[PDB]
Amino acid sequence: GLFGAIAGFIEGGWQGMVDGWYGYHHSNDQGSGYAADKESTQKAFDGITNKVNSVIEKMNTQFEAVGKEFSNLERRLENLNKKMEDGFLDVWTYNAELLVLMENEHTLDFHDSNVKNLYDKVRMQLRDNVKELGNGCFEFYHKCDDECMNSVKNGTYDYPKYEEESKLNRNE
Amino acid sequence: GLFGAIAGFIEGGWQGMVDGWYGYHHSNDQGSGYAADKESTQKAFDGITNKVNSVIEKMNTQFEAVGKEFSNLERRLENLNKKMEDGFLDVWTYNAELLVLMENEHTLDFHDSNVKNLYDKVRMQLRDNVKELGNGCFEFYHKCDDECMNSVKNGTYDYPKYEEESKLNRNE
Amino acid sequence: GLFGAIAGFIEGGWQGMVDGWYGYHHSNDQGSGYAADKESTQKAFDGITNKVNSVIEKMNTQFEAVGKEFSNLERRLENLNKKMEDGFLDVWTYNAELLVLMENEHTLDFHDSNVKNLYDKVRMQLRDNVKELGNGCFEFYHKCDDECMNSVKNGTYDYPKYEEESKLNRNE
Amino acid sequence: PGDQICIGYHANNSTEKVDTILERNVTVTHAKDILEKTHNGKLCKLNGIPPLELGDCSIAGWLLGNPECDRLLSVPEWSYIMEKENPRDGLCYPGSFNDYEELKHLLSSVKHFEKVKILPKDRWTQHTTTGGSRACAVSGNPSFFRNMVWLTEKGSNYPVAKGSYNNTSGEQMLIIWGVHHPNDETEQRTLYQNVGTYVSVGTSTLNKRSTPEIATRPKVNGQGGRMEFSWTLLDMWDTINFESTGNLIAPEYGFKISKRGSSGIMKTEGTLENCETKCQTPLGAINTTLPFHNVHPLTIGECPKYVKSEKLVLATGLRNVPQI
Amino acid sequence: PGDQICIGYHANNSTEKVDTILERNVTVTHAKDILEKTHNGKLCKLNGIPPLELGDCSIAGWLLGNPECDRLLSVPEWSYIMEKENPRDGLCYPGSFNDYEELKHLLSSVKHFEKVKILPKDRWTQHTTTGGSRACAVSGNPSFFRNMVWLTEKGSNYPVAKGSYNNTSGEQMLIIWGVHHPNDETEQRTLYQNVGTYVSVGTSTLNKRSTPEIATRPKVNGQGGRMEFSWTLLDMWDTINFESTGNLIAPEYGFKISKRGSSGIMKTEGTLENCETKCQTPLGAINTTLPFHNVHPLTIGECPKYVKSEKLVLATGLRNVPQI
Amino acid sequence: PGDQICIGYHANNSTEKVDTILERNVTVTHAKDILEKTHNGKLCKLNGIPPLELGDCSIAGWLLGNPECDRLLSVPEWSYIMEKENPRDGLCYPGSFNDYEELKHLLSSVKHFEKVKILPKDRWTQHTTTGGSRACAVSGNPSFFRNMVWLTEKGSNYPVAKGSYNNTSGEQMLIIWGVHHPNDETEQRTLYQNVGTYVSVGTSTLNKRSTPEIATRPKVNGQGGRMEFSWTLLDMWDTINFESTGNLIAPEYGFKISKRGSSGIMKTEGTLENCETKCQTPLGAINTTLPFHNVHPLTIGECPKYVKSEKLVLATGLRNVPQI
Ligand SMILES: *[C@@H]1O[C@H](CO)[C@@H](O[C@@H]2O[C@H](CO)[C@@H](O)[C@H](O)[C@H]2NC(C)=O)[C@H](O)[C@H]1NC(C)=O
Ligand SMILES: *[C@@H]1O[C@H](CO)[C@@H](O[C@@H]2O[C@H](CO)[C@@H](O)[C@H](O)[C@H]2NC(C)=O)[C@H](O)[C@H]1NC(C)=O
Ligand SMILES: *[C@@H]1O[C@H](CO)[C@@H](O[C@@H]2O[C@H](CO)[C@@H](O)[C@H](O)[C@H]2NC(C)=O)[C@H](O)[C@H]1NC(C)=O
Ligand SMILES: *[C@@H]1O[C@H](CO)[C@@H](O)[C@H](O)[C@H]1NC(C)=O
Ligand SMILES: *[C@@H]1O[C@H](CO)[C@@H](O)[C@H](O)[C@H]1NC(C)=O
Ligand SMILES: *[C@@H]1O[C@H](CO)[C@@H](O)[C@H](O)[C@H]1NC(C)=O
Ligand SMILES: *[C@@H]1O[C@H](CO)[C@@H](O)[C@H](O)[C@H]1NC(C)=O
Ligand SMILES: *[C@@H]1O[C@H](CO)[C@@H](O)[C@H](O)[C@H]1NC(C)=O
Ligand SMILES: *[C@@H]1O[C@H](CO)[C@@H](O)[C@H](O)[C@H]1NC(C)=O
């Protein structure tokens, strides 16, 4: 996709992450597991909710066919009425069908951007305290216990705190 | 947003940068200050100017309601005329309203792409002569005076020129 | 463009790469040359093929003008017919013209994303076994012969295989 | 071999498909179908109010009072009207109904009539009023449209017939009248005595006259003659005047519009069932909260918007990508 | 603690809001409102050319010459026509005007007439031409439509009335005539002497006849009789012929179309003010360079395009993000 | 100075331009023009079936049998009809044709007639049938529409004329008749003997009558009189009855609809050429696989969709960027 993350450098999705759209898998001495990123998921959810409302609300006044009848000496008027009601019908079918294809494309790319953005947020915070493995994972140069993991996951990882230890480990 | 820079890794906008959309804040021994990037701003300005013209010019022939009258034995024809003039009115309202929501989304993401792109341009030029702080700023490993800053800002920063000094400083 | 690669950090296109949209130029002891990336090109080709079909297929039922005639005591009906046939004509002209401008924008950005994505795929695989020059090229820290080049080009470059040699060379 | 954190995305067992511009048939983790495709196959009350079921009667059969339509002599408020494609019971005495489609269009904004006896039959003291036809026979005897009066010769005379009604009912009133075009002269004389007759109707805005046409026509329901009907909406406080030397088919009644609103005539061969809906189509009733439907373009009530699409499914989740 | 360069973006004090697909009510640094919502509340000259202000007259009152419309006996070129919803002064002698809406539609492409005296009254030497009605009274005396001639009996005779006009004016010419449908026989005889009359009109393409209808009708403006008017556009070099044994209401004039162009009839109760505009609506005039407006769908002149929207604001700048 | 791998993109010599939202006139490596702008300038057979070329005849001239239209007395199946803007040969005896546009609209779904001699001339034994006019002269002698019969006085009498036809042809049948409105009384008497005449037509659904109008009119093709024509589509197994004391212009023929389908009347001054197409326009034929065209809105056959655009070019390749 457009942002290169979903079905991209992050090769597959996670069946085991059941409580949100995007998130984390961690692995340390204490063990491993999945957790959704609540903030990115909530933002995406609000965005998508707004989108569906907007598409729907923009087609609340479309054309409505009114039943009318015409005599056998009113064929031109009948055909005009038919062409007209058919015409609007075709316009609204096209509008609904196009809007949906276009917004589906954007929706899928929006999720892809959100994953890439979360990845970059984490990356740009860990800096050189980690190895970037290339598959969506970062390998730490310092031991990172459960509380350390939680600081990463909520955006309060302390780079200066681990700078000295990682640098030594990265070099020996 | 889609490109992760605006209200993203670059957390806020700058009130003190009054002469363009995107740009720089520098800080050295000589002092500090803001400057717009003229080239990226001009390109964005030309793009946005074209966009507004294009939306406008695409709706220069829309429907126009013509006043007509109908007798009391011409109710079907009157209703046909009404449904028709109403129908086109609703089509053009939808077209104008949709085009504007869709293009607003793209406009906001376009500015976001432009900021990310300018950031990446600077990054990909400074390479490892700087620390990437993660907030839109780069910290230099070599002293970078006003003239050095100007080379960065106009895309003619000389990496080989500072390679030796930075590498030594980065290591000791 | 939106993804910063085409007419971006990769400054120009290659006349000498005649067999696809995106690809590689390599340079080693054995010599140099161009090669298309078949997989990214094929995916883009399938995407673009689908897009043109979709735009076309969405306008297979549009309005068609039917020839009718009206007496000199049927001027209101004639004008209604005219306004109607004109109205749909203007709607479909706008639809066709807009769809094309919008999809052209997306097409050009799609190619740009595809190039950036291929670049990132290669980058994220080579990691620190190469220098990122900033112009779309990577400079190797280990000798990379024709067979090594082919592993890069098909996504099976072996980082562990060259890790030790590159690290030594990068440091001395 | 250090500790790791990985960024990733949801995947589930969803097989929900969507289309996009670049790719068709994409599996996504969550999707929203926005197109209603189902209905209950029944004709129903609309918000508790039953339609007017015409059965075998046409609008004309109803309003003229074709004796085969007697169940409709008094009807309550309706929500829509059900008419068959080709109802059997319309003009039992054959003829025509001027501006008939315009009258049917009026019915789309009317939800009830009060039938008012505007010109009581008993007041035509100088004319015979018991005239009927085998074409409108009832129990083997000649009869006639229940709402109309066939004025004929009395004591071998037909004096000028004049009737007048001032609409004091409080609403606009639909009034129908006719002119009999006989097959031949023997018919004109036996019925009306006079030759060279006319039927004149006048209100403040309408001035409509007919001279009857004697002419040989193919038999319809056994009759070569024809009755040509016309109608008007008589405004409040306006007067309609009838005047005739013969061939007048007079209304006895007017239909006061007693309830106005959004309505319509639905063409259907079906019958009303004991069910309730907010949105009726000719195929059946819709009960959905979805914004679009593809059931039928001609709906009545509070309905989704109609489109021709076979499918409309919005992606809400992301691409559903198989595990590694 | 080295030197730094930072990449960033503009922010200001803007509170301009826009909507997008994903988010409503977004503050941006710059925005362009593309919807005109205001007008001056006045009816104005359009490009220096004043409308034709009918005041209390209808189109019919004007063209027939209802004596209450005498200010309109000669009018200069107009840019649009202002007519009230229900003008008081139309058919002062009551009746009808055939194809009246079609005539009004013709007026949308006409910007001036020259009224031509095609059939001077003085030339009806065998008929009385001074006939009027209390329904068109002027200063307490019976009078008549100024543009028309009521031909009646002279010396207890009404010989066949024939008038003819060849359109040599250089443009198509609008001509109106009428037929009087009397209330009764005493009226038919006192006015026309003859019974069993007709009014015939013929051009190269039109052949239209009437036999007058004597019939009792409710009084309108005091009259039970009616005048039914008809019209034609007489082509250049074509001849119109009138022929009648009675009941003819003859035109004395024709209206030569002297200026053609985009025009129209605006329905309004208002009056012309001393102001100037390029774009007139029934609510007032618009003066904007914006591409859209939401003022009123029925505009005349060089106008923005109308939409129902309450707002249309394009983002031009970026998201306006609070300082750190 | 190590080995290198570079990522890049295609560039060629393309000068193909496209527009986008942000930028006009962009050079791209590949593009797809989706708008057909060309045609062959000819009128052609449509799928091997030639149009009906009316030449100088109007639809009315054809169906009435104006003697200048004799090449059209028997025509084979057509794919469209070519009519001139102002054909010379229509009503040679002047008059009018009621519901003429409605008849032309019927022709849009008809592709062939079989002309059936429904009322053979020889069967009018009590009337003269050889009547013609200098207005329809042939070789210097008075003649008449080939499909119609001008019934006149025989032996100074015109008995009631009655003709009847039951449509047993197997399809709906178009039937035309007329009424002669004479210039004067001498004409009415010399032709019909009777005064105070009528023409009556009746089917199961139509009851249409005329009384002829004697009136002075400008000469058209030398004639002050007029023939007013009317038509009906006679249903299968229905009967049409004509009845007249004078002034009847009877059909001798009916046109049985023998082929139905999508067709139409194309307005053109041109002539059929020896060429073949799937899509005909008034300017010429289109042969393309492109989805859109901008040639002319009024097309017949299997056509692309029409738009007003001057250009529609989709980008397929990428931005074509000059070498470094
Ligand atoms: C028809 O009936 C009405 C009601 O009695 C007559 O009387 C007045 O008519 C006006 C006309 O609009 C009504 O508004 C009033 O309700 C009546 N008011 C008074 C004071 O009488 C009307 O005149 C009758 N028409 C005729 C021709 O007699
Ligand atoms: C009506 O007036 C015209 C103008 O005098 C008459 O004369 C000619 O008519 C033709 C018809 O189109 C005009 O083009 C010319 O201006 C006139 N030319 C000549 C040489 O006379 C016309 O004949 C008159 N009609 C009648 C019935 O008398
Ligand atoms: C007109 O011709 C038909 C065909 O002969 C007559 O006879 C029947 O008419 C019905 C009416 O729809 C047709 O369906 C049949 O083909 C005929 N069947 C039989 C058994 O006769 C018809 O009656 C004729 N009309 C008149 C008035 O005589
Ligand atoms: C984030 O996570 C840390 C580590 O568990 C926790 O102690 C802290 O309260 C959280 N801080 C914020 C700002 O949410
Ligand atoms: C860019 O900036 C430098 C440093 O101030 C200046 O000397 C030079 O002329 C500029 N070069 C270009 C190519 O704009
Ligand atoms: C990829 O390229 C290498 C190097 O030439 C080749 O040996 C190998 O078979 C290819 N592998 C795959 C999985 O395509
Ligand atoms: C869509 O995809 C499914 C499974 O991925 C496949 O079985 C099927 O062929 C496709 N359906 C259609 C209608 O093309
Ligand atoms: C929009 O945002 C403003 C300020 O951010 C807020 O005060 C207001 O509630 C919002 N307006 C609407 C109409 O929702
Ligand atoms: C488009 O670009 C070409 C070459 O890049 C240039 O010569 C020309 O001026 C432009 N054409 C138009 C129509 O603006």
Residues D115 and D241 in one domain: yes
Please indicate whether, in this complex, the C-beta atoms of C58 and A94 are within 8 angstroms of each other. Answer: yes
Distance CA E294, CA E37 (A): 6
Please indicate whether, in this complex, the C-beta atoms of C2 and B110 are within 8 angstroms of each other. Answer: yes
Q: Which residues are D28's β-sheet partners? A: D319
Output the CA torsion sign for F103, F106, F108, F110. Answer: negative
Please indicate whether, in this complex, the C-beta atoms of B66 and C83 are within 8 angstroms of each other. Answer: yes
Distance CA C46, CA F40 (A): 35
State which of F229, F253, F270 marks the end of a domain.
Answer: F270
Distance CA F135, CA F183 (A): 14
Distance CA F50, CA D114 (A): 60
Please indicate whether, in this complex, the C-beta atoms of D24 and C50 are within 8 angstroms of each other. Answer: yes
- The phi and psi torsions of E267 (rounded to 5 degrees) equal -85, 115
D105 part of contact set with chain B, CB < 8 Å: yes
Distance CA D90, CA F100 (A): 30
- What is the DSSP annotation of C85-115? HHHHHHHHHHHHHHHHHHHHHHHHHHHHHHH
Q: Tell me, rounded to whole angstroms, the distance of Cα D314 from its chain centroid.
A: 40
Residues E87 and E137 in one domain: yes
Residues spanned by the domain of C140: 1-172
Distance CA D248, CA F8 (A): 93
Instruction: Read off the CATH number of the domain in which C103 is found.
Output: 3.90.20.10
Q: Which residue has the tokens 């331009």?
A: F17
Ligand closest to F28 (CA) is 9
**CA A104 / ligand 7 centre spacing (Å):** 18
C120 part of contact set with chain B, CB < 8 Å: no
Distance CA C113, CA C116 (A): 5
Length of chain A (residues): 172
Distance CA B85, CA B64 (A): 8
Output the CA torsion sign for B143, B148, B151, B156. Answer: negative
Residues D216 and D118 in one domain: yes
H helices of chain E, in order, are: 59-64, 100-107, 185-192
Give the best residue of A6, A38, A74, A104 to mutate against chain D (max D CB count within 10 A). Answer: A104
Closest-lying ligand 1 atom to the alpha carbon of residue D236: 12
Ligand closest to A146 (CA) is 4
- DSSP type of residue D253: -
**CA C151 / ligand 6 centre spacing (Å):** 6
- The phi and psi torsions of F128 (rounded to 5 degrees) equal -80, 140
**CA C137 / ligand 6 centre spacing (Å):** 22
Contact partners of D by the rule of 3+ C-beta pairs under 8 A? A, B, C, E, F
**CA A138 / ligand 6 centre spacing (Å):** 27
* Ligand 6, residues at Cβ distance < 6 Å: C 147, 150-151, 154, 156
Please indicate whether, in this complex, the C-beta atoms of F102 and A75 are within 8 angstroms of each other. Answer: yes
Q: Name chain C contacts of F302, Cβ cutoff 8 Å.
A: none
Give the best residue of E21, E26, E308 to mutate against chain A (max A CB count within 10 A). Answer: E21
Residues F194 and F319 in one domain: no
Q: Which residues are D272's β-sheet partners? A: D43
- Check pocket membership of A39 for ligand 4, CB cut-off 6 A: no
Distance CA E100, CA E92 (A): 16
Q: What residue type is D161 in one-letter code?
A: A
- What is the DSSP annotation of E141-157? EEE--TTEEE-B-BTTB
B80 part of contact set with chain C, CB < 8 Å: yes
Please indicate whether, in this complex, the C-beta atoms of B75 and D106 are within 8 angstroms of each other. Answer: yes
Ligand closest to E239 (CA) is 2
Q: Tell me, rounded to whole angstroms, the distance of Cα D103 from its chain centroid.
A: 8
- Check pocket membership of D168 for ligand 1, CB cut-off 6 A: yes
- Check pocket membership of F38 for ligand 3, CB cut-off 6 A: no
Please indicate whether, in this complex, the C-beta atoms of A75 and F233 are within 8 angstroms of each other. Answer: no
Nearest CA in chain B to E5: B26
E213 part of contact set with chain D, CB < 8 Å: yes
A5/chain E closest Cα distance in angstroms: 21
Closest among B106, B113, B157, B105 to B22, alpha carbons compared = B113
- What is the DSSP annotation of E124-186? -TTSB----EEEEEETTEEE--TTEEE-B-BTTB-PPEEEEEE--SSS-EEEEEEEEE-SSHH
* 8 A C-beta contact, residue D150 and residue D129: yes
* 8 A C-beta contact, residue E79 and residue E43: no
Residues D45 and D161 in one domain: no
Provide the token pair at F147: 């499909």
Q: Give the resolution value in Å.
A: 2.0
Give the best residue of C42, C43, C54, C108 to mutate against chain D (max D CB count within 10 A). Answer: C54
F22 part of contact set with chain B, CB < 8 Å: yes
Q: What are the residues whose beta carbons fall under 8 Å from the beta carbon of C149, sequence distance 6 or more?
A: C24, C26, C28, F5
Residues F125 and F17 in one domain: no
Give the best residue of B18, B108, B114 to mutate against chain E (max E CB count within 10 A). Answer: B108
Task: Show contacts of D131-138: CB within 8 Å, 24+ apart.
Answer: D131/D191, D133/D92, D133/D93, D133/D223, D134/D222, D135/D92, D135/D93, D135/D94, D135/D221, D135/D222, D135/D223, D136/D66, D136/D67, D136/D92, D136/D93, D138/D67
**CA D218 / ligand 3 centre spacing (Å):** 12
Q: Name chain A contacts of D292, Cβ cutoff 8 Å.
A: 59, 96
Q: What are the residues whose beta carbons fall under 8 Å from the beta carbon of B82, sequence distance 6 or more?
A: none
Radius of gyration from C-alpha coordinates of chain C: 27
D100 part of contact set with chain A, CB < 8 Å: yes
Ligand closest to D217 (CA) is 3
Q: What are the residues whose beta carbons fall under 8 Å from the beta carbon of E105, sequence distance 6 or more?
A: B68, B69, C75, C76, C79
Output the CA torsion sign for E63, E66, E68, E70. Answer: positive
- Check pocket membership of A93 for ligand 4, CB cut-off 6 A: no
H helices of chain F, in order, are: 59-64, 100-107, 185-192
Instruction: Determine the straight-line distance between the first and last CA of chain C, rounded to whole angstroms.
Output: 40
- Check pocket membership of F200 for ligand 3, CB cut-off 6 A: no
Rounded to 5°, the CA angle B73-B75-B77 comes to 105
Closest-lying ligand 3 atom to the alpha carbon of residue D219: 27
* 8 A C-beta contact, residue F167 and residue F235: yes
- What is the DSSP annotation of D85-102? SS-SBS-SS-EEETTHHH
The SS3 call for residue F45 is: strand
Ligand closest to C38 (CA) is 6
Closest-lying ligand 1 atom to the alpha carbon of residue D166: 1
D276 part of contact set with chain E, CB < 8 Å: no
Please indicate whether, in this complex, the C-beta atoms of D233 and B72 are within 8 angstroms of each other. Answer: yes
Closest among F180, F250, F251 to F215, alpha carbons compared = F180
Residues F243 and F298 in one domain: no
Provide the token pair at F40: 């062959």
F64, F67, F68, F72 alpha-carbon torsion, rounded to 10°: 60
Provide the token pair at E145: 């439509």
A79 part of contact set with chain C, CB < 8 Å: yes
Q: Which residue has the tokens 């001495």?
A: A29
**CA E318 / ligand 8 centre spacing (Å):** 18
Please indicate whether, in this complex, the C-beta atoms of C1 and F319 are within 8 angstroms of each other. Answer: yes
Nearest CA in chain E to C79: E105
- Longest CA–CA span in chain B (Å) reads 98
Residues F265 and F297 in one domain: no
Q: Name chain A contacts of C106, Cβ cutoff 8 Å.
A: 105
Q: Which residue has the tokens 């109205």?
A: C87
Residues F170 and F310 in one domain: no
Provide the token pair at D151: 């004025």
Task: Say how many C-beta atoms besides its own lie within 10 A of residue E302's C-beta.
Answer: 11
Distance CA D299, CA D283 (A): 9
Closest among F38, F109, F55 to F268, alpha carbons compared = F55
Q: Name chain F contacts of A79, Cβ cutoff 8 Å.
A: 105
Q: Which residue has the tokens 């030639």?
A: F50
Q: Between residues 142 and 181 of chain D, which touch chain A (CB distance below 8 Å)?
A: none
Instruction: Read off the CATH number of the domain in which D113 is found.
Output: 3.90.209.20
* 8 A C-beta contact, residue C165 and residue C148: no
Residues D241 and D204 in one domain: yes
* Angle, helices B75-126/A38-58, rounded to nearest 10 degrees: 150
Number of domains, chain E: 2
What is the experimental method?
X-ray
Number of domains, chain B: 1
Closest among E279, E281, E306, E284 to E294, alpha carbons compared = E306
Residues spanned by the domain of E181: 50-270
State which of D227, D250, D270 marks the end of a domain.
Answer: D270
Distance CA C56, CA F304 (A): 11
Please indicate whether, in this complex, the C-beta atoms of E264 and B71 are within 8 angstroms of each other. Answer: no
Please indicate whether, in this complex, the C-beta atoms of A84 and B80 are within 8 angstroms of each other. Answer: yes
Q: What residue type is F237 in one-letter code?
A: W
Contact partners of F by the rule of 3+ C-beta pairs under 8 A? A, B, C, D, E
Please indicate whether, in this complex, the C-beta atoms of A117 and B91 are within 8 angstroms of each other. Answer: no
Residues E248 and E279 in one domain: no
* Ligand 5, residues at Cβ distance < 6 Å: B 147, 150-151, 154, 156
Contact partners of E by the rule of 3+ C-beta pairs under 8 A? A, B, C, D, F
Provide the token pair at E150: 């009521």
Q: Which residue has the tokens 């007008």?
A: E39
The SS3 call for residue A137 is: strand
Which stretch of DSSP H or E encloses residue C52? helix C38-58
